[PDB]
Every structure is written in C-alpha cells, then in structure tokens.
C-alpha cells in the first residue's frame, strides 16, 4: 500500500538473515569483548592492570587467539579500537577471529545521557553519523552491531517511566533499521538493570512491558526480525535481594517473558549476564534449554560471565596467558553446552 | 511494581489456558456456527430456505448431532439464540455438543457501526453489559467467546486508516480482558477483508501492521496470551484479482505474517475462511502445516468452508439430513487432516 | 489526503459551534441536574426525602421553573428520565427550560465499570446504541450531551495508570465524535477525583498528562473542537488534606494546566465542582476570571455547588419551594458573576 | 507523583519564558540568517557570488550592522560559523546584534537523513553532543536555538507516513528538552513542504495532524511551552498549483490549524516563509493579524522573505551595501507592521 515501508532489498535481507542464524548457531554464542576504554579500566582495575593500549591489545589477542574458541563462539563484539587494532605480534584482531570462523561485530552506540527532567533515566546516543559508521565497519569486516540501552526498576519512583521506555524503544528501532540498511545484523539490547530489592515477578512485569514496546517500535520502523537478534536481561530478583532466585525460577520467568512478547521470526535471544557469576550465567541458560525446544534460539552474549576468571587468571602477567586461555575455553564450553541444555555444572505461573 | 496490572487469578488463568489448548488441539479445529439472524438468512437464501426459528433449530441440530464430529471439531461457536435453544427433538444444543466432547463457545459482539468521519470504516460494538453477559454464558456452558472486527484494504483511500486500526485493537483488547475476567477464552478476530484488487504482498503488509497493533493492545490491557486464541484472515490476493495466489504462496505469506507479529505464548491461530472455497480453505491450511512444526497451532475456525456443501446437500429438505451430515464430516476430516499437514486433496521472501 | 477524516458537514458543524458558544456564553454557565436514580438518592438521603418519581419531578420542576434562571444558566444537563418527564403541574421539563431560553442537555454515558486487572480503575460504558440514542434525544430537544469518565490519583499505586488514561481518552473521543455526527455538542468530562492527600502540584501534573492524552485522542477521532466543551476538575489539593489551597493557588494552577494542554479553538471550559462548597466553587471560578481575558471561556457546570443549599432549603417540604428557588437564584447569580470575575463574595510557578 | 517529570528549575524556567516573550515581542520577529555553507551557496549562486568565508562575513555584517534593525527584529538565527565570526572590520557578529538589542540564536540540528525503507522521508539528526553544544553556544551569547524537521505531502504515496511524523515529533521533543536544560529557548520547526499540487485544505489537514503529534510529544518529554516557540509552515496550496490561495484563505486556514492544535501557554508562533515571495509573506502575516487578538503572538522567522531583495540589491558588490541595508529595513518594517496587522502593502470553514 501507499504509506507502508518500501520493500527491503532481497539480497540485503538474505545476507542479514543468514548471518543472524550463523550468530545464533546451536551450541554457540557471543563473546562480548566490546568494553570501551572506561569500562575496560574497571575490568582491569579489579586485577590491578594499567589500562594502556598495549595491555588492551595483549588481552584482546589473548581472547581471540584462543585455539578452538570457534567451537563455542559464533561472534565477538568489538570496541572500535579493537576492530582496527593489531595484536602484539602484528596480526589484525579481525584476522584472529576469521581464523577461528568467528564473526566480528561492532558496538556502535555512543553511550548514555540523562533524559532531561527524569531521575537520571538514560537515553542512548549515537544515531548521528551511524549510517556512515556502519558502512566503514562493514568494510573493516564487521557483520553485526550492538547498541545498549539501559532501564532501571524503582517502584517508589515509577521507574522505568513512560519516557524512558519510549526513548529506549525509539533509539533501538532507529539503530536497528540503519544497521540493516548497511548490511549489519543489529543486536537489540534493552538492558533492565538489576539495581534494587524488587522481586523476580516485578522484573518479569517490567521486562514484558519493555519488550512489548521495543518490538512494536521495531515493527513501526520496518526492522526485519529475521535479520536481527535480541540481547535482553534474564528475569531475576534485584541485586539487593539477599536470596538469589533459583535457576529453575529464573529460567521459567525468563522464557515466559520472552514467549509473551517476542515474535518467533526473530532467530535468536542472546542473553546478557548483567553481573551474574560465571556459574550462574551458565546454569541459568542451561535450565532454559532444558525447557526446549523453543521458537527461537536461547543463547548467550556474555562479557563478564565469559571473562571474569580469565582476567583473574591472567593478572596482567604475560606468563599466565595459556592458563587464561584455558579458563576462557572452560567457560565457552560450559555456555555452549548450556545452549543445548547439556551443561553438567562446574567448579506454570501465570 | 505500582502501576502495573494486578496478578491474574492463578485458578482462572489455569482454566483459560487449559481450555485454550483444548480448543487448539492437534488434528482439530472450530466449527463457526454463530451466524446471526441476518447472516444465516443470507446463507439460507442461497439455498432457498425460509429463515424461521424451526429451520434454524433443525439445521443447527443437523450440524451438532453429527455422530463422530468431535474427532475433528474441538469447539463450536454459537449465536446466543442457539446457546439457549433445543433441537426439534427437544435436546438442548449444548447437550449435543457435550455428547461429542465439543466445547461450546459464544459470539459476544453486537456487530459493526461506522466510525464517524471515516469512509465507512467499522467499529465493533458490544462492550456494554459484556461482563454480565459473559457470566450468564459461562453458566449456560460456554467456555470461549468470539468478537469480530473488520478492516478494509483500499490504497487509494488509505484504508485501513490509523483510526480504524486503533479502534479495532482497543475493542478487541477490552473484550479479551473482560472475557478472561469471566473465565471465557477470547477468540480475537481482526478480519482484514479480501475486498479489492490488491496483491498478496499488500495483504501481508496490512496484516502485519494490524496484528502488531492488536498484540501491543492485548499487552497494554493485561490479556493473558496463554488463555487466548487468534482468528485472523489468511494472507491472500484481493477477491477482485483474476488469479488466486497459489496455496504455496498463501501459506508462505500467512505463516510469515504470523511469525513476524504473534508472540509464541499464544496457543493457537484458528483461521477464518473469509469467502474461500471449501477445498481452498483445506489446501491452504494443509500447506501451512507442511511447513511445521510451528510455535503455535495453526488450525481452522471455519463457517462457510465447513458448511457450504452441507447447506447445498440439505436444501432445506429434511430427508437430505444424513447426506448433509456426511458432507459435513467429509469437510471436518479434511480440515482436521490439514491441521496435521496430512490432507491429500479432495473432489524465502523478506 | 487519502487516509484522513472525511470533511464534517458544514451545516452540522455550524450548528454545533453556534450551540457550543451559546452554552459558553459570557456571564452564564451550566446547571448539572443529571443525577441518576442512585445518585439523586444520595442527594435526597442527605435531607431525608424519599427518592420517588413524584419527588424527583417536584424537585426538577422547582429547579427549572425558577423565574429568571436563564439570566445566569445557559444550559441544563438532564438525566434521561427528566428529559421525558412532566412537572407535577403537567408541563414538560424541556418546555420549562425553553421558556427561560435554557438549552436542554442529556447525560448519555451508562456509568462506570472496573477495568480488568486494575486496582478498581474505571472505564465509562455507553457507546453501544449511543448514536441511536443521540438521534432520539435531539428529537426530544437536547442540543448537548455529557459523558463522565473518572480517574484517581494514588502515587503509591501508580494511579492513574497508563491503561486508565488510555481508556478514558478513547471512550471520550468515541463519544464526542458520535455526538457530533448526531448534532449534539459533546461535553468531555475527564474528572480527576480529589480522593487522597496529594498536593495541588500533583493534581496539576496529573491533570496536564490526562488532558494532553484526551485532546490528542479527540484529534485522532476527528472531533470538532469548535463544537465541543470541556468539563474538567479544577486543580486542587486532595480532599484528605487538612489545608485547602488558597483560591489564588487553585486559580493559578487550574488556568496553567488548561493553557498548557487545551487548544484555543475549544470555546468553553465548564468546571465541575467535585465536592467543593458552594462558596469555594464560586470564589475559585471568580479568581480565574480575574486573570482574564482568556483564550476560551472559563465557566461552570455545577451540580452540588448550585443545589446544595437549595436542597437544604427545600427539605422535601413543598411549602419551602419559593425559598429554595431564591437560594438557587443566589448561587446562579454568584457563579454568573464569577464567570465575569465580578463576584464579591457571599455568606508564576513553572 | 512518582513517574512524572521532575520539576524544572524555577530560575531556568523564568529565563526561558522571559526570553521567549522577548523574541515574540509585539511588532517584531526573527531574521533567519542561519543558512549552512551549502544553503548559502544556493542563495549566493542565484546572484553569482563566490561562497567564500570573506563573502559570508561581509554579507552577515551587512545584515546585522543595519542601523535601526532592532526596531523590527527581536532575534537573529545564526549558523555556527557566524556565531564565532568577526565582521570584515573586526567586530564579532554577536556584538553587532547586541548593539541593536537583537537576541542571538543558533541553529543546532545536523541536517537531514533518509529514514530507512521510506520513500526518502527525512529524520533530523543532531542529538549527539547537543547538550554540550548548547552549553558552549549559551556561553558565546546564544539565547535560543532552532532545529528544522521536514515533512512532505504526497497523497498517492501516503506521505507524510506515520513513521515520518513519529520521528519528526520525537526529534523535536528531545531537542527542545535538551535546549531548555541548557537555558536556550527552543524554536520547534516542523516544516511541511509545499512540494506538490495538493489543495490548501489538504495542507490544513496534514498540518493539524503533524502539530497534534508534535505537541503531544513535547508534553511527553516535559518541554516547557512557556519557554518555547513554534516555527511552522503557513497553510497554503502546494507549490505546483497554478493558483496561489488568497491571502484571506491562507490566513484563515493557518490560524484555524494553530488554534485547533497549539496550547495557548506557548508565547509565539513565528512562521517560516517557505518559498513565498517577500510581499506574500508580509501580506499573509498581516491578514492573520487583522483577525486578532490571538492567544499567542503570530509573527515571522523569515530567511528568504527578509533577504531576497537584499541579496539582489547587494549583487556581491560592496558599493551596493547601503542600498542593500535599506531594502532589508523596508522588509523588516513591512513584517513588523504585519505582526500588528497594520501593513499597508508594498511594491468560517469547519
Ligand atoms: C553485553 C553483555 O555484557 P555482560 O554479559 O552484561 O557483561 C555487552 O555487549 C555489554 O553491553 C557491554 O560490555 C557494554 O559496554 P559499555 O556500553 O559499558 O562500554
Ligand atoms: C468465523 C469464520 O467465518 P468464515 O470462516 O469467514 O465464514 C465466524 O465466527 C464469523 O466471524 C461469523 O460467521 C461472523 O458472523 P456475523 O458477525 O456476520 O454474524
Ligand atoms: C457535573 C458536575 O457535577 P459536580 O459539580 O461535580 O457535582 C455533573 O454532570 C456530574 O458529572 C453528574 O452529577 C454525575 O452523575 P452520575 O454519573 O454520578 O449519575
Ligand atoms: C527558517 C525560515 O526559513 P525560510 O523563511 O523558509 O527561508 C530558517 O531557520 C530555515 O529553517 C533555515 O534557512 C534552514 O537552513 P538549512 O537547514 O537548510 O541549513
């Protein structure tokens, strides 16, 4: 009809859909290694390492040159620096990924900014120049992108407010359509933070409301779900709760929230770990995939939950490199097995 | 949180979800026998039968007393008259349904009314007194309800307009929540009419936009998808097209439109036949279920496509009753087999 | 364009706009005498009068036969019973109104019903058959209509919820367009109740949000603002507050909330009195009209604030009739003078 | 309540409201001199002048050093280059404005970009870094800002589409709130282009729909209308029409469209001239202000309609400077008089 979205290029759509399914491949998930300069500082400060360019290059090479990582990792999200970086030995980071058949991805948002006259609710910035950036990143080897939006739960303050949800959904939908116009699969990340002492049922209600708004906006903006991925938070108690919900509970409410809101043309839901321990992140995903088969792949896009022990094993010490790659492999295998519901553990409500 | 829907009664939710799954049972579908007085007149005029109460009672008894119908029919939608009617032999219509294990359902809308200052776009009326009606109907044996909204495609006139879609979605969401509060599974019927000469791709675009709006509104109104059913139109060419789309095309675009918009917590999509021939209705459903397995049951809620030949065989003649029940069984079996993708025929684009 | 509202009949629009301006006439306002059977019982119980048909007829005749009332009263809202009623002396109620040049109006909503899964938030019912009712009421002499929606403020519960506001706005917009299609000026009444201990600034915020939503919906539904009236609550402290806001404060925040949301094509804002005393209702309106001139008429549509002392003077005693009509005239004059900012009293913040 | 906008700083709000009223001063309007490098090239190519920095500095100095211009010009919108530029004689451009008491303003958008999968419908870019830019611009002397969004009318293509309107409104509301957080009055410019052969009544319908959406979004984002200005298109026939509407018609439909959508807390509507001749722009504004008094100031924010003859008189020739300033004064006086409805000409439908 007149007034509807123009037809997407079949050739572009096929590439997006093929790459989205490759990223959401059974038994595999995403390594989120896209910490910005300031975020990697936090990661590095926790093990007392100077956040220099050489240390960042050493560490990202340690990750991406891990032999056999591609058995469990389908894609790696990079920060812009890393996409154009060489390892200490001189090899481009993207070439390390290609050697393992890992698809490079690129974080494209420009971080967070307070929405005026909210109680420090956040807009995600980055649409300006995004289309041109996506073209350059595709040329450099990226085939998917990531944009992080953030929402808070605070019942006393009415958070997340209508304005927060509307802004998050609008930014994610604009970003996703721009990515697809430039042949990048968009990872849509509406992260609801665990901050607070709310119950898991409150997280479930908020997650549903947010995802319903996000997917309506994706439709409004002509986003191709077949060529997109979702990166949501699992549904959990708030982080100030003294009792973490059981893995069975987390899996139940997470799957329920997704099935109530996510159309099944979407190929993959790649969870963020959002402060969970490495073992919880694996056990929670495993429990969801014992409830399968599902209408979309339920898998992982983990940063902290894939790297925490790796970092602690490396300690900034070059000599600890092999040990560090071994622990990364241990966690990659755990989460690949969890994708299949076959992880053995390591060291209806309406 | 404060400001969200109160929790639905677990006992009510369980009943709704159990009955919705019973209606969307594999190998079965819905007989839509809820023609109002004026609509059954049309049906009867086409075979030259006087639209008297006795003829209506005779015909509905002919349908519901068909021995073995419950093998293929999970539920029967009734008009209010029929819900409180006895067969010519004195048996309540609901008792005929119960004897076959067919769940009674009830049409609860009060028909269509033009939206002011539209080009005869239609609102569905009936919310006033609906909650009280649902209570009475549950007492009388109904366990699901139906509400029909209607949209037109007309590119030159911009139909369906924003106001049409907004009204359809609002009425369906209010109706569905009221039904569930009264322990009735709501069938949500946003019918996009085939009127016009538009292509199947136009029907697909409009269907997507409408369903995205409907399901956002269902979420806004706290409707439990686990205890609801969808009754949409298949995606087809307009009825003024000289070439009907292939069964393969209709199945592809119909499944695609659903997977792009319908969250998989919904248990069943029960298609309306919307003027299609009996054989097309079966072949189109069969073709969709050759593409399975699907995240929800794809089945039928057919009026014309289950009764056309039955009516033509009955001819208002009492003596043609057995013959008429035989042809009804033939079509019920065809469509039950089509639900499984096993109907043998009778007498990716982004 | 294709997809926009069809043009309203110029002849119908002119009648609506002329009658809306007659109702919002300088120095005059509306007598709200449309208490349903159950609401007039409350009014009558407060003075110990049996709520019989004869007593209702006696009292409404006492009101409408008050000589000279038309100097201050432009229109009178009636309950359906009264529109078709005769005075104890045999004169039709509408003929009493016509003799004073008071325009008859008619309440057309069917009362309130809880929205499912809200904390007893209310939908207004009555759209079914409304168009046909409006035709009959126009024939009987009504030239404007009234539909009351209700919202609550409760910060701890997040009231009014998004669903409440969406439903209120949708019902009011549908009702208003149906009225105008039938040559009745719609009074749009989104009453925010005073219940609770919130501050006047909270009432101001909520009133703004509600009115912004209402007027967006009126536009979506093709409502002619030139032929409509608004009946909102004044902006005040909650009724559990021990200190009532000053008349200066109430006037400031009320005018501010209106000027921030109401397009000036609307001819009149006719305030409800919402539990205020007779004197407060007059002084608050007077204070607003000392701040004039305004882009729309600020006037009154008072029930309790025009009748409280009248009822107390009548006491159900026929002999107290003249005294009762005198006190009604006293309050009508007070509020007519308040419309002009000339009431002498009786017995910027961003 | 919890969940509403935090209170705006009273000190910031007072400054914004005072400056907005100063800009919308009776008998005055805005000189729009904010042509970007590429737009001023077009302007300069039409008179055959090389678009060098020195020529731009010469011309902007010619404009802003016009003696007595502040009698008719309350504010001047600048391009960023000009805000930080000195005249050929060495005087900062902002100091020329201050000497005449003209308030400096700054264009802050980053231009237009196609919305993916639309028929070259445009988003306005520029939110990234906007808050930080506004701080710098305030320091440099700017007290108001401008952001231009663009919509097209094309009935056959359904333009402006829902996505276009939603994007325009979202960008304008985000921009306006960010400006106000940084003490800049935002000019909200949703320009509906005249392109096409549509009638004035089509322009009126589209303008209403767009403005209703814009002002709902401004409310959603907590924008202070008391400290904002609107810069809309007048309501006219499309530019391909052989007959331009009468000045009486343009004034009627323009005022009507505003009064149907713009809340009267907004202090000023400062029209763009949008391709009209200098004389039409003045006569159309004059005709609107013969229909006064209005609930907001109706005035001008003219680029082409204040400069066309000035440019043609200058011809890039330095010696033509005084003549050019004289013609600028002639047009400034014409439009200041038109603001009052006192321009003498130069060389109800529902
Ligand atoms: C994902 C999953 O992260 P997580 O598993 O929560 O550590 C990542 O892409 C994060 O969104 C990313 O680390 C955020 O980076 P900044 O936006 O903080 O730089
Ligand atoms: C369904 C499927 O009907 P169909 O297969 O299209 O004949 C039915 O419930 C219809 O919606 C029903 O026949 C409509 O009845 P009226 O609203 O016209 O009385
Ligand atoms: C108005 C003003 O009433 P008020 O001044 O608040 O007493 C009236 O039309 C009321 O809305 C009316 O009394 C409501 O009647 P019910 O809906 O309670 O019958
Ligand atoms: C206004 C009025 O312009 P106009 O009277 O239509 O010439 C200006 O601020 C314009 O919006 C401005 O000239 C647009 O500049 P670009 O965005 O094209 O650089």
DSSP string for residues in B236-275: ---TT-SSPPPHHHHHHHHHHHHHTT--TTS-EEEE--TT
Spatial contact of A289 and A341, defined as CB atoms under 8 Å apart: yes
Closest among D188, D308, D203 to D250, alpha carbons compared:
D203
What token pair was written down for B30?
Answer: 């819905």
Closest among B218, B347, B268 to B74, alpha carbons compared:
B268
Side-chain half-sphere exposure of A199, counting CA atoms within 13 A: 6
What token pair was written down for D29?
Answer: 């309007």
Closest ligand to C-alpha of residue C146 is: 3
Q: What is the SS3 string spanning A214-248?
A: HHHHHHHCCCCHHHCEECCCCCCCCCCCCCCCCHH
Q: Which pairing describes strands C185-192 and D29-33: parallel, antiparallel, or unpaired?
A: unpaired
Residue D158 at interface with chain B, using a CB cutoff of 8 Å: yes
Region of C3 on the Ramachandran plot (φ > 0 left; ψ -120 to 50 alpha; else beta): left
| Helix, strand, coil percent content, chain B, rounded in steps of 5 | 45, 15, 40
Backbone φ and ψ for A51, nearest 5 degrees, come out as: -80, 70
Ligand 3 close to Cβ of residue C133 (< 6 A): no
Residue C6 at interface with chain B, using a CB cutoff of 8 Å: yes
Cα distance between residue A114 and residue A124, in whole Å: 9
Active-site residue flag, B113: no
What token pair was written down for B348?
Answer: 């990716």
Backbone φ and ψ for C303, nearest 5 degrees, come out as: -100, -80
Positive/negative CA dihedral, A287, A289, A292, A294: positive
The technique is: X-ray
Residue D319: count of CB within 10 angstroms of its CB: 8
Cα distance between residue A152 and residue A158, in whole Å: 10
Cα distance between residue C82 and residue C33, in whole Å: 9
Task: Tell whether residue C43 is among the known ligand binding residues.
Answer: yes
Give the angle subtended at the CA of A292 by the CAs of A291 and A293, to the nearest 5°: 165
- Which of these is catalytic: A159, A231, A249, A278? A231
In chain D, the residue whose alpha carbon lies closest to the alpha carbon of C161 is D3
Q: Which helix (H) or strand (E) holds C178?
A: helix C162-181
What token pair was written down for B78?
Answer: 């009734």
Cα distance between residue A97 and residue A108, in whole Å: 19
Backbone φ and ψ for B148, nearest 5 degrees, come out as: -100, 120
Cα distance between residue C57 and residue C73, in whole Å: 20
Cα distance between residue B108 and residue B106, in whole Å: 6
Assign A324 to helix, strand or coil: helix
Helix axes D37-45, D304-314, angle to 10 degrees: 50
* C-alpha D128 – ligand 2 centre gap (Å): 52
Chain D neighbors of A16, CB-CB under 8 A? none
Cα distance between residue D30 and residue D301, in whole Å: 4
- The 10 Å CB-count burial string (b at 16+, else e) for B37-47 is eeebeebbeee
Cα distance between residue B188 and residue D43, in whole Å: 58
Instruction: Point out the ligand 1 atom lying closest to the alpha carbon of residue A146.
Output: 9
Ligand 3 close to Cβ of residue C311 (< 6 A): no
Residue C344: count of CB within 10 angstroms of its CB: 8
Cα distance between residue B73 and residue B29, in whole Å: 5
Closest among D258, D181, D151 to D5, alpha carbons compared:
D181
Cα distance between residue D103 and residue D23, in whole Å: 7
Cα distance between residue C105 and residue C102, in whole Å: 9
Cα distance between residue C42 and residue A315, in whole Å: 78
Cα distance between residue D61 and residue D47, in whole Å: 18
Spatial contact of D243 and D273, defined as CB atoms under 8 Å apart: no
Cα distance between residue B229 and residue B125, in whole Å: 20
Residue A113 at interface with chain D, using a CB cutoff of 8 Å: yes
For every residue of C29-75, DSSP letters joined together read EEEEE---HHHHHHHHHTTT----HHHHHHHHHHHHT-TTGGGTEEE
What token pair was written down for A291?
Answer: 């409830």
Residue C22 at interface with chain B, using a CB cutoff of 8 Å: no
Of B78, B79, B148, B150, the one to substitute when testing ligand 2's pocket (max ligand atoms within 8 A of C-beta) is B148
Residue in A209, A263, A291, A295 to test binding to B, most B beta-carbons within 10 Å:
A263
Q: Which domains does chain A have, with CATH numbers?
A: 1-350 (3.20.20.70)
* Residues linked to residue C146 through DSSP beta bridges, in sequence order: C107, C187
Most distant pair of Cα atoms in chain D: their distance: 64
Residue B295 at interface with chain A, using a CB cutoff of 8 Å: yes
Backbone φ and ψ for D122, nearest 5 degrees, come out as: -115, 130
* Residues linked to residue D300 through DSSP beta bridges, in sequence order: D271
Instruction: Point out the ligand 2 atom lying closest to the alpha carbon of residue B306.
Output: 5
Q: Give residue B284's Cα distance to chain centre.
A: 16
Active-site residue flag, B189: yes
Residue C330: count of CB within 10 angstroms of its CB: 15
Residues contacting D18, CB < 8 A, separation 6+: none
What token pair was written down for B320?
Answer: 């043609």
Task: Tell whether residue B98 is among the known ligand binding residues.
Answer: no
Residue C128: count of CB within 10 angstroms of its CB: 19
* C-alpha D133 – ligand 3 centre gap (Å): 52
Residue A36: count of CB within 10 angstroms of its CB: 14
| Helix, strand, coil percent content, chain A, rounded in steps of 5 | 45, 15, 40
Distance (Å) of CA C191 to CA C124, C209, C296, D343: 11, 13, 19, 46
Q: What single DSSP character describes residue D137?
A: H
Our CA-based measurement puts residue C128 at a distance from the nearest CA of chain D, in whole angstroms, of 28
Cα distance between residue D330 and residue D337, in whole Å: 11
Task: Tell whether residue B146 is among the known ligand binding residues.
Answer: yes
For every residue of A127-149, DSSP letters joined together read -TTHHHHHHHHHHTT--EEEEEE
Pocket of ligand 1 from Cβ distances under 6 Å: A 32, 34-36, 39, 77, 146, 148, 189, 272-274, 301-305
Chain D neighbors of C261, CB-CB under 8 A? 219, 263
Residue D10 at interface with chain B, using a CB cutoff of 8 Å: no
Establish whether the linkage from the previous residue to C293 is cis, with ω within 30° of 0. yes
Residue for token digits 């000599």? A319
Cα distance between residue B259 and residue C67, in whole Å: 69
Spatial contact of C30 and C300, defined as CB atoms under 8 Å apart: yes
Cα distance between residue D32 and residue D300, in whole Å: 9
- Which of these is catalytic: A35, A121, A167, A189? A189
Closest among C98, A10, C167, A239 to B174, alpha carbons compared:
C167
Backbone φ and ψ for B60, nearest 5 degrees, come out as: -65, -35
Question: Is B2 within 8 Å of C127 when comparing Cβ atoms?
Answer: no
Give the angle subtended at the CA of D72 by the CAs of D68 and D76, to the nearest 5°: 90
Residue in D6, D201, D219 to test binding to C, most C beta-carbons within 10 Å:
D219
**What number of C-beta contacts closer than 8 Å exist between A and B?**
102
Chain B neighbors of A213, CB-CB under 8 A? 216
* Residues linked to residue C73 through DSSP beta bridges, in sequence order: C29
């Amino acid at each position: 009809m007149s007034g509807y979205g123009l037809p997407i290029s079949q050739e572009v759509a096929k590439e997006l859909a093929e790459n989205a399914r490759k990223i959401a491949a059974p038994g595999k998930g995403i390594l989120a290694a896209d910490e910005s300069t300031g975020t990697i500082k936090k990661r590095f400060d926790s093990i007392g390492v100077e956040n220099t360019e050489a240390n960042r290059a050493f560490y990202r090479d340690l990750l991406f040159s891990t032999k056999g990582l591609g058995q469990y990792i389908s894609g790696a999200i990079l920060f812009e620096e890393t996409l154009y970086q060489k390892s200490p030995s001189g090899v481009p980071m993207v070439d390390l990924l290609k050697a393992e058949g890992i698809i490079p991805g690129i974080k494209v948002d420009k971080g967070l900014e307070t929405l005026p006259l909210t109680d420090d609710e956040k807009a995600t910035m980055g649409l300006d120049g995004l289309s041109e950036r996506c073209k350059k990143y595709y040329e450099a080897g990226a085939r998917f992108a990531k944009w992080r939006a953030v929402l808070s739960i605070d019942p006393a303050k009415g958070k997340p407010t209508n304005l927060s949800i509307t802004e998050v959904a609008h930014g994610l939908a604009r970003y996703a359509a721009i990515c697809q116009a430039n042949r990048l699969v968009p990872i849509v990340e509406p992260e609801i933070l665990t901050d607070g002492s709310h119950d898991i049922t409150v997280c479930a209600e908020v997650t549903e409301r947010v995802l319903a708004a996000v997917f309506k906006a994706l439709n409004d903006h002509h986003v191709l779900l077949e060529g997109a991925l979702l990166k949501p938070n699992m549904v959990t108690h708030g982080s100030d709760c003294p009792k973490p919900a059981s893995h069975e509970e987390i899996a139940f409410y997470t799957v329920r929230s997704l099935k109530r809101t996510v159309p099944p043309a979407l190929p993959g839901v790649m969870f963020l770990s959002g402060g969970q321990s490495e073992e919880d992140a694996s056990l929670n995903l495993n429990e969801m995939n014992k409830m399968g088969p599902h209408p979309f792949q339920l898998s992982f896009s983990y940063g902290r939950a894939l790297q925490a022990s790796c970092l602690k094993a490396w300690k900034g010490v070059p000599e600890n490199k092999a040990k560090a790659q071994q622990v990364l492999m241990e966690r990659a295998r755990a989460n690949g097995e969890a994708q299949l519901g076959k992880y053995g553990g390591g060291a209806y409500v309406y």
